[PDB]
Amino acid sequence: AIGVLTSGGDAQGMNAAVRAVVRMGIYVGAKVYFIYEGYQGMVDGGSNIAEADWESVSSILQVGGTIIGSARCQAFRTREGRLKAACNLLQRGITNLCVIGGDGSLTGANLFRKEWSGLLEELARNGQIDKEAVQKYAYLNVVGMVGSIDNDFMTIGTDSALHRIIEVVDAIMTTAQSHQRTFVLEVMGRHCGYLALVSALACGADWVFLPESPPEEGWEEQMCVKLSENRARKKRLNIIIVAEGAIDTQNKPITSEKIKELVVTQLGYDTRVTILGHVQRGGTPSAFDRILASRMGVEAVIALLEATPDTPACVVSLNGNHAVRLPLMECVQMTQDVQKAMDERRFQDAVRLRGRSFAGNLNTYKRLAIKLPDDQIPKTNCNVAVINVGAPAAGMNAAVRSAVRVGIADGHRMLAIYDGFDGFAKGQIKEIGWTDVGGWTGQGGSILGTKRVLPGKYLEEIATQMRTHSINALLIIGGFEAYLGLLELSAAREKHEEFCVPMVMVPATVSNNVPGSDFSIGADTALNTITDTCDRIKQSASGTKRRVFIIETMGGYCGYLANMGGLAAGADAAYIFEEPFDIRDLQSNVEHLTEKMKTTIQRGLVLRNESCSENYTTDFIYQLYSEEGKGVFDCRKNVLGHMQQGGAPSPFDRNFGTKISARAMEWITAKLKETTDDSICVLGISKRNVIFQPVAELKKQTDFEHRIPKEQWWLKLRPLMKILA
Amino acid sequence: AIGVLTSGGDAQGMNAAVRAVVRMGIYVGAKVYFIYEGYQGMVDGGSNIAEADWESVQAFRTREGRLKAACNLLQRGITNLCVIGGDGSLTGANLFRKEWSGLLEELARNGQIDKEAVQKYAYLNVVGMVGSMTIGTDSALHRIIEVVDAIMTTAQSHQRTFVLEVMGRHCGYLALVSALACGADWVFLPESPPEEGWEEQMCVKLSENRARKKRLNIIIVAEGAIDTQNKPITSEKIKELVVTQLGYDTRVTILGHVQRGGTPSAFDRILASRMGVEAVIALLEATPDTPACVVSLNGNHAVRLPLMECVQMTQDVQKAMDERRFQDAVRLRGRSFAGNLNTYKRLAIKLPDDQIPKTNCNVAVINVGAPAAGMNAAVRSAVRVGIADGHRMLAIYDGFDGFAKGQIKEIGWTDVGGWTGQGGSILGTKRVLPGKYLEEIATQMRTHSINALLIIGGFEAYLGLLELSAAREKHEEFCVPMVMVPATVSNNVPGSDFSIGADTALNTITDTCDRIKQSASGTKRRVFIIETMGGYCGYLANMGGLAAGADAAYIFEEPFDIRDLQSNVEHLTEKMKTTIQRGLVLRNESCSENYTTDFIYQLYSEEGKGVFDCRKNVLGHMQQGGAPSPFDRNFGTKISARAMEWITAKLKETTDDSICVLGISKRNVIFQPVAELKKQTDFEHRIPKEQWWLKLRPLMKILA
Amino acid sequence: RNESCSENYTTDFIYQLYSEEGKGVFDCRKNVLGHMQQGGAPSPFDRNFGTKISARAMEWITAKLKEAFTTDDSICVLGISKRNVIFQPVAELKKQTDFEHRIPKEQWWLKLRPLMKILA
Ligand SMILES: Nc1ncnc2c1ncn2[C@@H]1O[C@H](COP(=O)(O)OP(=O)(O)O)[C@@H](O)[C@H]1O
Ligand SMILES: O=P(O)(O)OC[C@H]1O[C@](O)(COP(=O)(O)O)[C@@H](O)[C@@H]1O
Ligand SMILES: O=P(O)(O)OC[C@H]1O[C@](O)(COP(=O)(O)O)[C@@H](O)[C@@H]1O
Ligand SMILES: O=P(O)(O)OC[C@H]1O[C@](O)(CO)[C@@H](O)[C@@H]1O
């Protein structure tokens, strides 16, 4: 038997995590019990512990919060409580625990496992039979999942919280614009700064205050200088993000009110403070959080099955896009050590302890917020060109912004090419500066413009422009055509010397079909649009009852959107190109759905990637389900279309765009401090790492006929859709 | 020449208002100038006054300023002013019109030629638009309800009480209508203080909620909430009170300036557009004998209210507030304010069961047609008003399908708790009509002793009523009072100008159109052909077209041919020469049997070759939507409450007048016998014969 | 495939199923014959059927007129029924007709359905 509970602050995605624990549990043939109101429900026992069936967790995954409740329980901190808690579990035969919560909830579970010796006091007291003390003894497997928006310890709810913050910032930006105003926004993260940092990065904030890294003396003047510069630059508003637990090098709090006093005093600007508060914990879970929570739920169940008495309690986690089990005790220690470092004022150590990507976000943030005066930037005599190629993808503008500003910070001269290779061939090229890309981070589309056309038939005109504009390097932000483009330019090197320069691309496309990257800029935005659209369609179906929607999604031959969207939306099926399916597979899902209509959940959702089959079209499927569903359910078909691309990029796509482009520019600058295969590369994400791969080496790994990679990491998740539905 | 400016606090929709003043201005053959930075830009002059073309879309409190302001206008030949702002901005314009004859000081000084003093004299037409139904209110309300919906998930988890401070230091309309829209547990308004003993009354309500097992409380507090002694009631004091008396876990959130931000709702965009057009017209029609006015929307008609009278009105409310003429304050806010207030209190506070005088009647509630956002709010309201009136409420599930199958169960006050913000239909809704199931349904009415019927639904609800009316002679079980409220995304129910759900759909369409335009910056030279829902009813395509700034919206109610199509293609082709190289064409799904979404896509593609390309998108059932908009929540709630009052009244006493549609008609909500609606209905296409919104078709040409 | 044999299982549907499940073994083509089926010159059978049946109808008309109508029996279908050509009142044919699909309820040739199995 398995008990699942939620403790500490609630986080969006908890319901998904619970959903996945119950369904994976049941699918493996275990019994699963909800424990309501966190530990308190464990202590109180009784109706607070209830067995969960397949039906109990439908309609839950798209909702914020925890449907089974959470609570700070003082009774569990006492020995008396844990004794009663332990007793209640034994009554239900529950020796497997899954705890979803923060630092505190998991330390509580750590403690509970150590003291599972409490069973002896059950023996000494009336409590339990001796057989029980031996039968359930040290047979307490505990697995933890972190669910705090803080990222205190990637955590469930962080992405959702960030969507929340950025929604507020984007809303505030229209009102700050009117006349002129400076806004001071207090965001969550008690003693963690991750949220503030990543929000700042995501909105191009003018200043940020973190607990892990205090400001340093003289910040008051530095900040006011920056704000005066902005007014001189005519920027119609300022945004300053402040972590709840922002502090002095002396550990004194820096409050939002003090920041306001400072700005009004020094500069007399019109200033307002907004404390976002608990809104950050609310709203619907993002696509990322739903998928993350699902993978974690499934992994937590597996960990429990596989656990031995010799194996220590673990926390399931995602490291480098792999499911890992970290010793719970070690993780608890880690969290104390950061606070220790903070208290002792070893602030560099605090940042070190938060991990590689934390320092990455921090350095990248500063680089893009604070421009050294021109005189200070030495300059070197290269011109670096930036371009967009392929369909538009949310996050392209953030990417250009970052590349330009890093380029300028490195003393290059930045050239913007407009309309992809179309504009390139036509000489649509202009210098671009730091100020030009101001405000781009949250802008959807492509401001430079993007086209699909390939360079191959325009090699001479393009070579001319490179010579004409003395172009020393090229950064291409774009999709599969960007990659084909690089291949063409690589091949054209022998006949045109102008292409014997360093060239790199970052992947930007809604489809996520670029070889050399697990992720592409824009796909998270699309997933969020698909997921929201599916939530609605499902509601429509649940209003009518006995209805199945067949929904066509984008992606080309790339199944990423249909598959991940399917998971995030709770679809019953997702047909993709990468997994052949036949009429037997189709009949089988129809029969499954027909069974499902005998239950309470009388809706269905079937996703079909647009190019998944030449014969088994969206209509074909619609017709089969319709005909074989007769008398039990009816269908509707919907082709989502271009609206899936979505609009403004999600916080993930903003920051992906920003970070990955910054990294590409560093590589360009480094190459210029010095032409063959290794100078024409795709900068992609590969399991934990961002890496530069020669386009020549990516050919072997690519299916050119269908424009998808040969190996796609996410196909290992296919079993999850079956299970989770 | 026309000058347009924005003053006072900003509001979402202001840009739409400005857009419409410029375009209507130019279309009428006037010249239009933007005046930047409100009155200051008028005083400073210079580049702060700029002429506007088609493509584009303290010192005033002193006499010295106004003199310079007046001068700057005369230089540009501007004697027509459109001011978009609040109380203060409009009083400023009132004052400026009074003192215009101090063009004479321009004469005495070198200022101006005498010819000018006579040529532009008392020829200052001023028209005002309020931006602080007023433009931006609906948007602000979307903002508040987004925050409340988000907070509800986290309060759930923790069994927590939330105290939310919303805007309104002087006016309580936002807090009131937010409370109504989220089923808040308590509300505090400036116009209506609580009354002594509220502390205990509020705590009793919260304890009752816990006993009812409600996992959270939401208390909405206007910024300027006050006691009968005008002392502030703050959100902190409310928190102290709850923690003290009940010891519940309580948190306070001050929404702040978020409420002024975000994108304009569909309603605000359309409202602003109609107000902009109406402001220009008022200016043209104005004479020197004509007083300065404020354009407004009263009962869905464009009206011009004397500006001076409106200023006086505003003072009078603050005056009443000063001496505790609190009833007078509420009186002065208007009929619909008191309406919202009474409806809110009815649904928030249940008298103890012993207290409520019992009818012996059972009243049934049902959903019929496709799902529409706001249906659950409607059920909630009807149920609770029914119980408050001492009836027993029966929920019928799955429309007439469940009705014929006896899927009927008593439902209570607690059962409908939390429904207000829930999309879909929780009872379930089906399209099937009663006609072939009359005996089985008659049986259920008899079996469950059903005394009256409220149907929340679409055109099939109306057909259903017709069938049940006709079946009265053969079945006495249908000789009961029956009423329907319109719920459908399509807005095609005869007898109503609006239906529950359509606003939500409009907002979905509008948001989707915005998103498409935000993407696609990359190709430029693109036109989207977008298919919308509505059946034969053009409301969604048309109103969506306006709100989204579409270049065309093809609908069934206005035949169009290949010439009309060729003509819009040529127009768009011209538009691609300009800077604004992105086109939007909406097509109602049933607007033509031959001229399909693909047909149009194909024509525009082929004739646009070398100039632009197209994409098509069929939006689909997402339009049925997710959570209802604040308007649909409150429409649902209010209209259903009204229907239940009518039922209770009828039961204190069958012919044509007992089977009715409760619909909105020009300023009024009215009960119309279904027999009288037949003549007014096109049954072949399921739409009304006369549709109020078709008078707006010229606007899209003008505003595109 | 009869054109209206199924609302979902269309000519394309079938084409697609047979194509997909025939992969590696056979391919398909689809053809909708269309209005050519109406036209051309009639076959000898249709000429002579037309001729003979109409002649017979005219005889009946003549015969009815010698009586000089309000009976059901004066409004008829002259049809072929197992060896016989017979006049049937349209009122009596209503019970035998599926008006929704415009076909007779009983169709003689359905007894031949087993033959196609056997003969192919
Ligand atoms: N050191 C501990 N020992 C026992 N239980 C704990 C401990 N720390 C936290 N808890 C449990 O977790 C709950 C509070 O969680 P908290 O400390 O806020 O961390 P988080 O909210 O991040 O999980 C309490 O109800 C308590 O039962
Ligand atoms: O998959 P790609 O070729 O990177 O392009 C992404 C976009 O292109 C599409 O295939 C549609 O093509 P268009 O943008 O040219 O209309 C969508 O799937 C997606 O939005
Ligand atoms: O216009 P109606 O018939 O009242 O129904 C409203 C809904 O029905 C639709 O026509 C769709 O019908 P279906 O749900 O049966 O496919 C849409 O136009 C609209 O959302
Ligand atoms: O929900 P409470 O009790 O206000 O706690 C607030 C704290 O909890 C957190 O959500 C951490 O889990 C932080 O956002 C915040 O610092």
Side-chain angles (χ1 to χ4, degrees), chain A residues 8-10 12 37 63-72 164 168 170-172 174-175 178-179 181 183 236 272 274-279 281-283 392 418-419 444-451 529 533 536-537 539-540 542-547 549 636-648, chain B residues 6-8 10 12 37-38 143 147 149-151 153-160 162 215 251 253-258 260-263 370-371 397-398 422-431 504 508 512 515-516 518-524 526 528 615-627:
Chain A
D10 74 313
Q12 314 92 325
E37 313 302 335
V63 187
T66 166
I67 198 67
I68 66 175
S70 170
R72 92 151 286 274
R164 254 17 103 214
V168 165
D170 292 354
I172 291 282
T174 69
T175 189
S178 302
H179 294 285
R181 258 197 218 109
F183 263 95
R236 292 202 104 95
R272 300 291 145 83
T274 310
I275 299 97
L276 270 66
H278 288 261
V279 172
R281 301 247 299 269
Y418 290 77
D419 271 357
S446 179
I447 282 159
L448 299 188
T450 186
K451 286 212 175 319
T529 296
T533 296
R536 286 167 185 248
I537 287 168
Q539 223 178 41
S540 177
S542 313
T544 297
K545 298 177 185 147
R546 293 183 173 272
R547 175 158 287 187
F549 277 85
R636 293 300 186 257
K637 50 156 295 201
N638 272 23
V639 182
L640 300 193
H642 232 77
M643 27 130 171
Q644 297 168 252
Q645 284 191 358
Chain B
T6 51
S7 178
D10 73 312
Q12 302 315 319
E37 311 301 335
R143 255 19 103 213
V147 166
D149 292 353
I151 291 282
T153 67
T154 186
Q156 199 68 34
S157 304
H158 288 282
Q159 227 151 1
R160 254 206 269 249
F162 264 93
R215 293 188 62 81
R251 305 292 298 188
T253 310
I254 301 97
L255 272 65
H257 289 282
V258 172
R260 301 217 133 139
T263 77
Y397 290 76
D398 298 352
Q422 291 282 106
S425 177
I426 282 158
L427 299 187
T429 185
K430 286 212 175 319
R431 288 177 179 288
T504 294
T508 295
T512 295
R515 276 199 285 82
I516 288 166
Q518 264 156 63
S519 187
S521 307
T523 299
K524 309 151 189 147
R526 173 159 288 186
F528 297 97
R615 294 300 186 253
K616 51 155 295 201
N617 262 52
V618 183
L619 301 194
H621 289 75
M622 78 171 178
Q623 298 164 264
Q624 284 189 3

Side-chain angles (χ1 to χ4, degrees), chain A residues 8-10 72 102 147-150 152 187-191 195 244 277-278 280-281, chain B residues 154 158 160 162 249 251:
Chain A
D10 74 313
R72 92 151 286 274
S148 61
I149 61 163
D150 299 343
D152 265 342
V187 308
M188 277 177 162
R190 270 175 299 167
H191 303 319
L195 268 182
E244 267 177 330
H278 288 261
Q280 308 169 68
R281 301 247 299 269
Chain B
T154 186
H158 288 282
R160 254 206 269 249
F162 264 93
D249 195 16
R251 305 292 298 188

Side-chain angles (χ1 to χ4, degrees), chain B residues 36 48-49 88 91 99 129 144 183 186 196 201 306 395 441 531 540 547 632 658 667:
Chain B
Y36 290 108
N48 290 294
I49 298 175
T91 37
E99 304 190 354
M129 278 182 235
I144 293 168
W186 209 267
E196 303 170 38
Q201 269 161 38
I441 292 174
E531 190 186 296
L540 287 178
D632 280 324
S658 39
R667 185 80 130 78

